Amino acid sequence: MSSRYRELIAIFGEFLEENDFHVRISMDRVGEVKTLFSAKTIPVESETEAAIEVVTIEAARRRDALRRTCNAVLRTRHSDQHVDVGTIVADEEERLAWKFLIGALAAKNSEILPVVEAELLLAAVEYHYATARPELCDMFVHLSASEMFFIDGDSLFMAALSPQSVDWDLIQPLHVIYNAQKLLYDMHCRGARFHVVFFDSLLWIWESAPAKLFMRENLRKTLMSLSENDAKVGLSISNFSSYYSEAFETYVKQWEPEFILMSDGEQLGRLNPLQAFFVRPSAANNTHDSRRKANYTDADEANPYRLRRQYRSIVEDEAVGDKSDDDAGGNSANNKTAGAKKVNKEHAGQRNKKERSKEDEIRERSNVIAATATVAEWHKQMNHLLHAVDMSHGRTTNRDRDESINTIMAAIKRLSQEKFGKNFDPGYTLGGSTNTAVPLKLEMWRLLVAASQLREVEFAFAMEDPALKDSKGASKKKDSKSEYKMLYGFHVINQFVEREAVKGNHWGQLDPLRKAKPDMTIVEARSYLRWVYLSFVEMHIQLKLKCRVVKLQLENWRAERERARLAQESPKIALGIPLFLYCHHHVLAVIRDEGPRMSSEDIDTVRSALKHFDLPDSYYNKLDQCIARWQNMTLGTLLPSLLPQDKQLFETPEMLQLIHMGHLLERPFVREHDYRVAFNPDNWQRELLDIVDGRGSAVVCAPTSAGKTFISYYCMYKALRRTNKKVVVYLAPARALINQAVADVCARYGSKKYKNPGRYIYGALGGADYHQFHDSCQVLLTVPETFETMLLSPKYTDWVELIDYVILDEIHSMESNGNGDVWERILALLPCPFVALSATLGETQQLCSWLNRVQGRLKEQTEEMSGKMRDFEVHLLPSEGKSIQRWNDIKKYIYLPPPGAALTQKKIKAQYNNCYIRDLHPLSILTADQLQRGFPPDISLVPSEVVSLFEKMHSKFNEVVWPNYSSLQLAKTLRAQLMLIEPSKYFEAETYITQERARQYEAEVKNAFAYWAYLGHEGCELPENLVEEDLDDFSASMNMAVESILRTFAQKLNEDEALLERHAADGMEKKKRMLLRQQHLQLLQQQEQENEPNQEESMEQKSEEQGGAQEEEQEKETVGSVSFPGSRQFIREHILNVLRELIARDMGPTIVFSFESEDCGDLVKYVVEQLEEAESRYRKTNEFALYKARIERAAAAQEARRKQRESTLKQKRLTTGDDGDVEVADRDMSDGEGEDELFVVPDVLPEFTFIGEKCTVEPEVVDSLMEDCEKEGEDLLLRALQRGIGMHHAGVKGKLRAHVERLFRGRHCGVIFSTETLALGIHSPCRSVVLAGDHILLNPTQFRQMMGRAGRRGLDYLGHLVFLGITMRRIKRLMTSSMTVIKGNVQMDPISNLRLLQLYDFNTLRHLKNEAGWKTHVLKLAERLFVNPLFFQGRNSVAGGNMEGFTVEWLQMLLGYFQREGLHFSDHASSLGSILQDAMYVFREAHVGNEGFSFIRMLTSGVFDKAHYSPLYDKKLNSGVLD
Ligand SMILES: Nc1ncnc2c1ncn2[C@@H]1O[C@H](COP(=O)(O)OP(=O)(O)O)[C@@H](O)[C@H]1O
Ligand SMILES: [Mg+2]
């Protein structure tokens, strides 16, 4: 204590004038010191914001750095002999150390500068390397790689020469370079990179030990790759130099966006040569792009590094370099607890979320086989019956056909009051109230059609397809009128007439042939014929009301074009489109249908509008013509164009067809499909269903919005409807937890009754419901591990055989970010037909082979009986294709504020963009990318992507004329394609609108674009020239050709992708660097103000030295001090404003994605803050004073009327006698009870456009959910929720979080803040998707779940993904990447094989008989396991291929290692144990061959005959650690 603080002063004063300690008593010029440190290195003060936090943020982790810079300065400022002495400050020696400094700084003012500045710039680069703790990632695989990756070789060489950590193996006499080859052959072989290696050198700095052992490898790999190929040689390398140094490597580094792999440091130090000149690149990188650094650790695959932490800018200098618990709880405490709670389980799940509809379920009980008999027990002639049976129970005819006709009454009565309507007068618009009406009315009579305008007569069969037609046209042709039907409706009498006629055969022999004759004029002959009259009443009734829409759309669309024609241009066709698409929707009905005239109705109305709408003739004759076949069964021909019947043009900048294509998003989607069992839905089902109806395997790819999961509950429909005794199973995306709520909710579209326990669903292990209820039920819901144990697991075997049928979710999403071993196990083993669920998988074939294989192996094992029928595995893509990414397009447009703005913003105010969302147009459309990648995901959309791109492509690959497309047939090889892409884009579904088949154009024109790129920017490498067949390939003009189309790429391309994330992204960083530098113009100048020249013994200024310098901007504020792009909590300031403007472009619900957990809470908090603020800014007597006035005044008056009536009623008194004249009290009591008139002060306007506009759910329950939360209040969810801020994150109770989710789906709330889970095993409606940060992890894996999100189910036309969007480039590295592709793991695992061992040897324990059954089950099991054998990455390991057996060399080593081991249990004295010798009594007889050569079942037979037994105790207790 004392002694050490007597010491340190005596070291100091020797250097320079004695005492610091009292020369001066303070100083106090601290102020000099503190400037000098921080303006380089960080650590001086414990920097305080509002407050320092827990004071181990900057006690512990500060005082390292603080007393580092302290010591390492003073030791260097002790020079004049020694830098050989250490200076270490204690506590009270901090102040001392500073007094020692300040009185040395102003002592000389020359020597001081280098010994500080240099020491600083050294130590800074030391700390920058040390900035750190590290990460553990993981493996290599995730970011290793698409794309441009480098490793600079110097590093490469030292990676081979790296090891102790095992002294180097294999005796070789300095041929070592095999190392390089090995690593190359690892990560190209089963990875991508696109790899580049620099050799960035002479770095070296060798000898530190005799070398080199350099240029050997340099010249080697040079020669290898520049052979040109050899299939072992390629990577590829460049030259350069100049050492490290940038101003060389810049031009490269920019152009091909990458990330980096490099080796600072072990050891071998020496000091300055290594650490210095490697570290400083790292800094450089981070203050360019920013890129990031890895490695030199122990890769292949996973390593270190460092990231996404904020940098010190600038700081540089090159100047080195240099030349029982399931049981007993059911007994003790079960006196009354209370009396069971379980009643609080079932109830919860049975009130749980409502969303979707139904198909048939009722209680069933029976086991069904088919056979019927007389059971009377004869009749045995027909003359023993004569006449047999008659009408009775015929009341099912009587009433039902009365009711039928009573429809046509009501229908045409409702028609009456409508048809005349508000009869039209030219010109008034929009007026016209009944514009609204007919659209509603239409929907009504569509809802109604099922069972009270069509059948009470069965349908029946739905026949074969033409039957509906040919039995219709007949009926009309007997009746005098062309279109029979509605006017004078009811005509079921002349039906009966006709039906009796045509005697021999009743209806003539055509139709009863195809029906396989049922009833002659009895049941079926009536039931059918009825229903085909009758659909065609309903049909024509509606069809007329569709006419009446497109009819009066004429009028509303008149002045819409014409008034605005004068304006500048001639519109509306960007708003005039619904005319056309309505006229489409109308005539869309005809698909089987008899025309409803053309002399009144449909066609006449359509025609008048259509030639008025601009369309010159030619389009005319395509209309009637094609549809003529459809019409006919009815109609004649066509009017001439002559004789008033056309109208004014806009046309030609358009032409006909084009008018559609430019303006609109969204097309039909025609049903017709399956009508007994159905949804309808939209083809995918019409394939999928037929598999499960077999029984089988398969999987469905489906890129999301995807529809995937819900279609699996045909399994549950089968096992429930019919002989319920078999389990259906749904296996989760796993634990935690997300599966559970959805799984539960689905299955409770229809519970079902039983006898004594019985019971419907058991779950678990979880994170809800939680461990047990295990067993009894029909259908299950667990996770991989739970199910596994339940299988092997020897007492649960009973269950296994009763499982038909097992489906398990997600697929791709789990495969990547898991845990993608456990999967393989459960598709190798034991009964099922399976459905399985995946979004996109880029490798086809590879998947399907593995599957189909292991199906055939199951079939094999079940022999000789085989299966009942199926195996086989099917594999649904089957290809245009795409599923519900065809359904709607998703625009991506991204966040970037205009540099320099205000913030807060808020409400009841003018607004525009401003908003940071802008446009985008997908990042990169390029020359270089297209060569390799041509043309990658994610892109699709039309129109306005590839539409006007055509106009470019078609004007400049054809107008070349003709400079080197003339060698060889190149020019025509292109022009044979180009021209033809235009008709194929339209005339798939000509006449009205293309199907949805404007999609197909994208794939068409992908043959245009990518093909050119496979000529390209590169020479003869692609297409690869010399091969005889003609495109090129035998042109030496290939080079020329390549560079003719090189020109023809760039010119058109870069206009469209218009560089938003470059332009103002650099603007923001420009602002950042005018912001940061203004901080150094504060402190520098301020140091002179702190002392002031109101002081000091030098010439007076009287404080004319004050303020900043020297090129001057008004002092430091922008969008904030801390603007600070790509940084955290940047973000929040603008997120409020993003939101508010998305409500005031989009209108839908809004999800916000983030990383869970502290972060998500910080976000929520800040927004609640802002709103509470703005409420304080309304209530303080601005507009508010006026508002409250009214509401207060009128309330008074209300409650005074209460007292008014209370007076006049309280009279006093009827008097008509005496002399008072007439009066009777109380005669007026007609008024009245009134409520509530208002009072508000919780919240008004600033929160009321923040939360959703339109909503649902009666207020009672909403309030009561809030009420619950309030009691146990966690986050103060009670505050956040009611202010519109949804949440869903960890650290929230199950009851509370559950309340949130209902109210987002209920469309009560407007926003929600949560993590990535809500796109996975939970679901919500979305429209504007918001993403906060690109940190700390993304793969295109967990991107593409949220990518296709929005475009809601039958609702929204557009998804919107707004990115934040921290980095500059990484948009590209999400989008432009091709595909998340399978690449699994296994069985080879020790633990698996130990489990299998002990399973077999448990039945070996006392009690054999069943030995037979057991062992042959073990044979089957042994085959079933190791099914291929050998799965995915295991053939890239040590086997090759597909090999196995292979258990032998492991087995034997483990065999004499199981039980030798001392007392075992534990270290306590014998007995327990004394057995330690059992593993020598099985070794010799298992090493006969080593057991002992090829073929599966000789392995396990060899292992029938171990023992392989522990002392009992140990190996059991291994197996029971795991479970
Ligand atoms: N064939 C269909 N036609 C129209 N809407 C459908 C159809 N099938 C499903 N939907 C709807 O779309 C919604 C989203 O589909 P969904 O199956 O939940 O998602 P996922 O792709 O995650 O499996 C469902 O909630 C349902 O409303
Ligand atoms: Mg799903």
PDB file of C-alpha atoms in Angstrom, residues 530-728:
ATOM      1  CA  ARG A 530     -85.183 -31.978 -62.979  1.00  0.00           C
ATOM      2  CA  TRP A 531     -81.695 -30.858 -61.946  1.00  0.00           C
ATOM      3  CA  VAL A 532     -80.545 -30.066 -65.510  1.00  0.00           C
ATOM      4  CA  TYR A 533     -83.526 -27.768 -66.081  1.00  0.00           C
ATOM      5  CA  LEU A 534     -82.851 -26.107 -62.889  1.00  0.00           C
ATOM      6  CA  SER A 535     -79.188 -25.263 -62.682  1.00  0.00           C
ATOM      7  CA  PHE A 536     -80.026 -23.588 -66.022  1.00  0.00           C
ATOM      8  CA  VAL A 537     -82.707 -21.423 -64.399  1.00  0.00           C
ATOM      9  CA  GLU A 538     -80.250 -20.213 -61.754  1.00  0.00           C
ATOM     10  CA  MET A 539     -77.512 -19.841 -64.408  1.00  0.00           C
ATOM     11  CA  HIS A 540     -79.504 -17.573 -66.713  1.00  0.00           C
ATOM     12  CA  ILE A 541     -81.056 -15.595 -63.783  1.00  0.00           C
ATOM     13  CA  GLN A 542     -77.574 -14.645 -62.559  1.00  0.00           C
ATOM     14  CA  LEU A 543     -76.155 -14.156 -66.049  1.00  0.00           C
ATOM     15  CA  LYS A 544     -78.657 -11.361 -66.785  1.00  0.00           C
ATOM     16  CA  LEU A 545     -77.611  -9.630 -63.544  1.00  0.00           C
ATOM     17  CA  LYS A 546     -73.992  -9.873 -64.753  1.00  0.00           C
ATOM     18  CA  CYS A 547     -75.087  -8.153 -67.996  1.00  0.00           C
ATOM     19  CA  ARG A 548     -76.732  -5.395 -65.938  1.00  0.00           C
ATOM     20  CA  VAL A 549     -73.327  -4.662 -64.321  1.00  0.00           C
ATOM     21  CA  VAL A 550     -71.322  -4.206 -67.553  1.00  0.00           C
ATOM     22  CA  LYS A 551     -74.442  -2.359 -68.810  1.00  0.00           C
ATOM     23  CA  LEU A 552     -74.340   0.570 -66.450  1.00  0.00           C
ATOM     24  CA  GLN A 553     -70.535   0.582 -66.207  1.00  0.00           C
ATOM     25  CA  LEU A 554     -70.987   2.181 -69.662  1.00  0.00           C
ATOM     26  CA  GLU A 555     -72.249   5.328 -68.001  1.00  0.00           C
ATOM     27  CA  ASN A 556     -69.834   5.711 -65.059  1.00  0.00           C
ATOM     28  CA  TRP A 557     -66.979   5.222 -67.593  1.00  0.00           C
ATOM     29  CA  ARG A 558     -68.260   7.906 -70.081  1.00  0.00           C
ATOM     30  CA  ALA A 559     -66.870  11.123 -68.689  1.00  0.00           C
ATOM     31  CA  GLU A 560     -63.964   9.309 -66.980  1.00  0.00           C
ATOM     32  CA  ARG A 561     -62.081   9.229 -70.289  1.00  0.00           C
ATOM     33  CA  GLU A 562     -63.581  12.281 -71.999  1.00  0.00           C
ATOM     34  CA  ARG A 563     -63.339  15.080 -69.378  1.00  0.00           C
ATOM     35  CA  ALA A 564     -59.718  14.134 -68.706  1.00  0.00           C
ATOM     36  CA  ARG A 565     -59.015  13.849 -72.475  1.00  0.00           C
ATOM     37  CA  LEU A 566     -58.694  17.632 -72.633  1.00  0.00           C
ATOM     38  CA  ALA A 567     -56.273  17.683 -69.683  1.00  0.00           C
ATOM     39  CA  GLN A 568     -53.037  16.995 -71.562  1.00  0.00           C
ATOM     40  CA  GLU A 569     -53.148  13.357 -72.591  1.00  0.00           C
ATOM     41  CA  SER A 570     -56.040  10.989 -73.282  1.00  0.00           C
ATOM     42  CA  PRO A 571     -56.796   8.691 -70.322  1.00  0.00           C
ATOM     43  CA  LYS A 572     -58.174   6.583 -68.552  1.00  0.00           C
ATOM     44  CA  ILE A 573     -56.470   3.349 -69.130  1.00  0.00           C
ATOM     45  CA  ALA A 574     -54.794   3.026 -65.872  1.00  0.00           C
ATOM     46  CA  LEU A 575     -58.146   3.244 -64.122  1.00  0.00           C
ATOM     47  CA  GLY A 576     -60.347   2.440 -67.118  1.00  0.00           C
ATOM     48  CA  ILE A 577     -59.196  -1.211 -67.074  1.00  0.00           C
ATOM     49  CA  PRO A 578     -62.127  -2.564 -64.904  1.00  0.00           C
ATOM     50  CA  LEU A 579     -64.441  -1.950 -67.914  1.00  0.00           C
ATOM     51  CA  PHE A 580     -62.647  -4.698 -69.865  1.00  0.00           C
ATOM     52  CA  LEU A 581     -62.001  -7.056 -66.902  1.00  0.00           C
ATOM     53  CA  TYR A 582     -65.703  -6.784 -65.851  1.00  0.00           C
ATOM     54  CA  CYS A 583     -66.832  -7.593 -69.396  1.00  0.00           C
ATOM     55  CA  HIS A 584     -64.391 -10.535 -68.993  1.00  0.00           C
ATOM     56  CA  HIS A 585     -65.838 -11.591 -65.572  1.00  0.00           C
ATOM     57  CA  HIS A 586     -69.334 -11.455 -67.096  1.00  0.00           C
ATOM     58  CA  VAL A 587     -68.771 -13.652 -70.195  1.00  0.00           C
ATOM     59  CA  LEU A 588     -66.449 -15.911 -68.071  1.00  0.00           C
ATOM     60  CA  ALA A 589     -69.659 -17.669 -66.964  1.00  0.00           C
ATOM     61  CA  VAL A 590     -70.119 -19.321 -70.376  1.00  0.00           C
ATOM     62  CA  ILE A 591     -68.090 -22.524 -70.268  1.00  0.00           C
ATOM     63  CA  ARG A 592     -70.916 -24.947 -71.008  1.00  0.00           C
ATOM     64  CA  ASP A 593     -73.744 -22.556 -71.246  1.00  0.00           C
ATOM     65  CA  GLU A 594     -76.575 -21.895 -73.648  1.00  0.00           C
ATOM     66  CA  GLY A 595     -76.419 -18.261 -74.778  1.00  0.00           C
ATOM     67  CA  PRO A 596     -79.038 -15.981 -73.198  1.00  0.00           C
ATOM     68  CA  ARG A 597     -80.015 -14.378 -76.510  1.00  0.00           C
ATOM     69  CA  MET A 598     -77.848 -11.893 -78.342  1.00  0.00           C
ATOM     70  CA  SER A 599     -80.809  -9.845 -79.554  1.00  0.00           C
ATOM     71  CA  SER A 600     -81.772  -8.103 -76.310  1.00  0.00           C
ATOM     72  CA  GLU A 601     -78.557  -9.294 -73.642  1.00  0.00           C
ATOM     73  CA  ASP A 602     -75.048 -10.405 -72.898  1.00  0.00           C
ATOM     74  CA  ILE A 603     -73.411 -10.130 -76.304  1.00  0.00           C
ATOM     75  CA  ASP A 604     -75.331  -6.961 -77.361  1.00  0.00           C
ATOM     76  CA  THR A 605     -74.380  -5.037 -74.167  1.00  0.00           C
ATOM     77  CA  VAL A 606     -70.798  -6.289 -74.391  1.00  0.00           C
ATOM     78  CA  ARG A 607     -70.538  -5.286 -78.058  1.00  0.00           C
ATOM     79  CA  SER A 608     -71.756  -1.726 -77.505  1.00  0.00           C
ATOM     80  CA  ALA A 609     -69.273  -1.110 -74.689  1.00  0.00           C
ATOM     81  CA  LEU A 610     -66.399  -2.839 -76.513  1.00  0.00           C
ATOM     82  CA  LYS A 611     -66.492  -0.796 -79.629  1.00  0.00           C
ATOM     83  CA  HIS A 612     -66.587   2.333 -77.270  1.00  0.00           C
ATOM     84  CA  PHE A 613     -63.788   1.351 -75.306  1.00  0.00           C
ATOM     85  CA  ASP A 614     -61.404   2.253 -78.031  1.00  0.00           C
ATOM     86  CA  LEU A 615     -60.614  -1.042 -79.885  1.00  0.00           C
ATOM     87  CA  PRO A 616     -60.684  -0.672 -83.726  1.00  0.00           C
ATOM     88  CA  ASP A 617     -62.028  -3.582 -85.784  1.00  0.00           C
ATOM     89  CA  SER A 618     -60.217  -6.906 -86.276  1.00  0.00           C
ATOM     90  CA  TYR A 619     -60.543  -7.500 -82.515  1.00  0.00           C
ATOM     91  CA  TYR A 620     -64.270  -7.647 -83.273  1.00  0.00           C
ATOM     92  CA  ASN A 621     -64.033 -10.740 -85.422  1.00  0.00           C
ATOM     93  CA  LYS A 622     -61.755 -12.627 -82.970  1.00  0.00           C
ATOM     94  CA  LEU A 623     -64.417 -12.197 -80.277  1.00  0.00           C
ATOM     95  CA  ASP A 624     -67.583 -13.747 -81.710  1.00  0.00           C
ATOM     96  CA  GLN A 625     -65.548 -16.333 -83.710  1.00  0.00           C
ATOM     97  CA  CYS A 626     -63.652 -18.240 -80.977  1.00  0.00           C
ATOM     98  CA  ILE A 627     -66.543 -17.991 -78.513  1.00  0.00           C
ATOM     99  CA  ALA A 628     -68.935 -19.046 -81.371  1.00  0.00           C
ATOM    100  CA  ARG A 629     -68.364 -22.737 -80.670  1.00  0.00           C
ATOM    101  CA  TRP A 630     -69.119 -22.093 -76.968  1.00  0.00           C
ATOM    102  CA  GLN A 631     -72.253 -20.104 -77.908  1.00  0.00           C
ATOM    103  CA  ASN A 632     -73.487 -22.587 -80.511  1.00  0.00           C
ATOM    104  CA  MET A 633     -76.149 -24.909 -79.419  1.00  0.00           C
ATOM    105  CA  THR A 634     -77.784 -21.460 -79.587  1.00  0.00           C
ATOM    106  CA  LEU A 635     -76.657 -18.627 -81.776  1.00  0.00           C
ATOM    107  CA  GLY A 636     -76.365 -17.433 -85.355  1.00  0.00           C
ATOM    108  CA  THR A 637     -73.759 -15.107 -86.841  1.00  0.00           C
ATOM    109  CA  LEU A 638     -72.415 -11.560 -86.724  1.00  0.00           C
ATOM    110  CA  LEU A 639     -73.481  -7.982 -87.560  1.00  0.00           C
ATOM    111  CA  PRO A 640     -71.338  -5.934 -90.023  1.00  0.00           C
ATOM    112  CA  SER A 641     -69.179  -3.107 -88.584  1.00  0.00           C
ATOM    113  CA  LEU A 642     -71.234  -0.579 -90.607  1.00  0.00           C
ATOM    114  CA  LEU A 643     -74.215   1.374 -89.282  1.00  0.00           C
ATOM    115  CA  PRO A 644     -73.566   3.358 -85.999  1.00  0.00           C
ATOM    116  CA  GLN A 645     -71.962   0.870 -83.654  1.00  0.00           C
ATOM    117  CA  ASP A 646     -68.359   2.060 -83.108  1.00  0.00           C
ATOM    118  CA  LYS A 647     -66.738   4.840 -81.094  1.00  0.00           C
ATOM    119  CA  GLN A 648     -63.715   7.185 -80.627  1.00  0.00           C
ATOM    120  CA  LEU A 649     -60.087   6.005 -80.531  1.00  0.00           C
ATOM    121  CA  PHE A 650     -57.216   6.385 -78.130  1.00  0.00           C
ATOM    122  CA  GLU A 651     -55.595   3.499 -79.883  1.00  0.00           C
ATOM    123  CA  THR A 652     -52.053   3.167 -81.275  1.00  0.00           C
ATOM    124  CA  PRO A 653     -49.794   3.786 -78.818  1.00  0.00           C
ATOM    125  CA  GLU A 654     -51.570   0.653 -77.619  1.00  0.00           C
ATOM    126  CA  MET A 655     -53.016  -1.770 -80.172  1.00  0.00           C
ATOM    127  CA  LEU A 656     -55.727  -4.083 -78.881  1.00  0.00           C
ATOM    128  CA  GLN A 657     -54.022  -6.786 -76.774  1.00  0.00           C
ATOM    129  CA  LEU A 658     -51.457  -4.393 -75.219  1.00  0.00           C
ATOM    130  CA  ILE A 659     -54.120  -2.387 -73.339  1.00  0.00           C
ATOM    131  CA  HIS A 660     -54.456  -5.327 -70.902  1.00  0.00           C
ATOM    132  CA  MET A 661     -50.769  -6.036 -70.526  1.00  0.00           C
ATOM    133  CA  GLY A 662     -49.520  -2.580 -69.529  1.00  0.00           C
ATOM    134  CA  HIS A 663     -52.117  -1.756 -66.886  1.00  0.00           C
ATOM    135  CA  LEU A 664     -53.426  -4.275 -64.287  1.00  0.00           C
ATOM    136  CA  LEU A 665     -52.344  -6.716 -61.727  1.00  0.00           C
ATOM    137  CA  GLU A 666     -54.234  -9.844 -61.515  1.00  0.00           C
ATOM    138  CA  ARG A 667     -55.870 -12.363 -63.783  1.00  0.00           C
ATOM    139  CA  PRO A 668     -58.383 -15.252 -63.366  1.00  0.00           C
ATOM    140  CA  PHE A 669     -57.895 -18.635 -62.057  1.00  0.00           C
ATOM    141  CA  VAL A 670     -60.639 -20.942 -63.236  1.00  0.00           C
ATOM    142  CA  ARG A 671     -62.092 -23.604 -60.925  1.00  0.00           C
ATOM    143  CA  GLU A 672     -63.824 -26.853 -61.989  1.00  0.00           C
ATOM    144  CA  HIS A 673     -62.371 -29.863 -60.494  1.00  0.00           C
ATOM    145  CA  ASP A 674     -63.968 -32.193 -57.977  1.00  0.00           C
ATOM    146  CA  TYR A 675     -67.560 -31.947 -56.775  1.00  0.00           C
ATOM    147  CA  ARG A 676     -68.441 -34.430 -54.200  1.00  0.00           C
ATOM    148  CA  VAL A 677     -65.350 -34.441 -52.017  1.00  0.00           C
ATOM    149  CA  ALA A 678     -63.673 -31.050 -52.460  1.00  0.00           C
ATOM    150  CA  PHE A 679     -62.424 -27.858 -51.335  1.00  0.00           C
ATOM    151  CA  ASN A 680     -62.278 -26.831 -54.878  1.00  0.00           C
ATOM    152  CA  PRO A 681     -59.204 -25.880 -54.815  1.00  0.00           C
ATOM    153  CA  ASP A 682     -56.621 -24.540 -57.280  1.00  0.00           C
ATOM    154  CA  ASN A 683     -55.043 -28.685 -59.487  1.00  0.00           C
ATOM    155  CA  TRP A 684     -52.276 -29.211 -56.903  1.00  0.00           C
ATOM    156  CA  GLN A 685     -54.836 -31.041 -54.740  1.00  0.00           C
ATOM    157  CA  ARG A 686     -56.285 -32.944 -57.702  1.00  0.00           C
ATOM    158  CA  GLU A 687     -52.907 -34.697 -57.903  1.00  0.00           C
ATOM    159  CA  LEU A 688     -51.901 -34.818 -54.190  1.00  0.00           C
ATOM    160  CA  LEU A 689     -55.236 -36.244 -52.944  1.00  0.00           C
ATOM    161  CA  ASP A 690     -55.054 -39.299 -55.204  1.00  0.00           C
ATOM    162  CA  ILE A 691     -51.797 -40.388 -53.549  1.00  0.00           C
ATOM    163  CA  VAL A 692     -53.143 -40.266 -49.973  1.00  0.00           C
ATOM    164  CA  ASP A 693     -56.326 -41.973 -51.288  1.00  0.00           C
ATOM    165  CA  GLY A 694     -54.015 -44.820 -52.345  1.00  0.00           C
ATOM    166  CA  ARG A 695     -52.074 -44.751 -49.401  1.00  0.00           C
ATOM    167  CA  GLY A 696     -48.071 -43.890 -50.359  1.00  0.00           C
ATOM    168  CA  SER A 697     -45.232 -41.501 -49.963  1.00  0.00           C
ATOM    169  CA  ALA A 698     -44.485 -38.189 -51.434  1.00  0.00           C
ATOM    170  CA  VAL A 699     -43.549 -34.713 -50.616  1.00  0.00           C
ATOM    171  CA  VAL A 700     -44.732 -31.350 -51.986  1.00  0.00           C
ATOM    172  CA  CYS A 701     -42.504 -28.577 -53.113  1.00  0.00           C
ATOM    173  CA  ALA A 702     -44.209 -25.287 -53.051  1.00  0.00           C
ATOM    174  CA  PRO A 703     -42.405 -21.949 -53.019  1.00  0.00           C
ATOM    175  CA  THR A 704     -44.401 -19.489 -49.446  1.00  0.00           C
ATOM    176  CA  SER A 705     -48.065 -18.493 -49.136  1.00  0.00           C
ATOM    177  CA  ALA A 706     -47.861 -22.089 -49.840  1.00  0.00           C
ATOM    178  CA  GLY A 707     -50.840 -23.812 -48.779  1.00  0.00           C
ATOM    179  CA  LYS A 708     -48.560 -26.732 -47.505  1.00  0.00           C
ATOM    180  CA  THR A 709     -49.535 -27.965 -44.182  1.00  0.00           C
ATOM    181  CA  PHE A 710     -53.349 -27.990 -43.685  1.00  0.00           C
ATOM    182  CA  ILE A 711     -53.940 -30.425 -46.673  1.00  0.00           C
ATOM    183  CA  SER A 712     -52.567 -33.248 -44.476  1.00  0.00           C
ATOM    184  CA  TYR A 713     -55.606 -33.369 -42.205  1.00  0.00           C
ATOM    185  CA  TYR A 714     -56.697 -36.191 -45.598  1.00  0.00           C
ATOM    186  CA  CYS A 715     -55.000 -38.533 -43.081  1.00  0.00           C
ATOM    187  CA  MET A 716     -57.151 -37.589 -40.091  1.00  0.00           C
ATOM    188  CA  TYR A 717     -60.295 -37.732 -42.271  1.00  0.00           C
ATOM    189  CA  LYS A 718     -59.603 -41.374 -43.075  1.00  0.00           C
ATOM    190  CA  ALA A 719     -58.674 -42.820 -39.685  1.00  0.00           C
ATOM    191  CA  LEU A 720     -61.589 -40.990 -38.026  1.00  0.00           C
ATOM    192  CA  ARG A 721     -64.482 -41.615 -40.489  1.00  0.00           C
ATOM    193  CA  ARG A 722     -63.897 -45.289 -40.517  1.00  0.00           C
ATOM    194  CA  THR A 723     -62.752 -47.841 -38.001  1.00  0.00           C
ATOM    195  CA  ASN A 724     -60.897 -45.547 -35.602  1.00  0.00           C
ATOM    196  CA  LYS A 725     -58.181 -47.563 -33.904  1.00  0.00           C
ATOM    197  CA  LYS A 726     -55.176 -46.177 -35.800  1.00  0.00           C
ATOM    198  CA  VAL A 727     -53.064 -43.260 -34.970  1.00  0.00           C
ATOM    199  CA  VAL A 728     -52.416 -40.336 -37.289  1.00  0.00           C
TER     200      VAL A 728
END
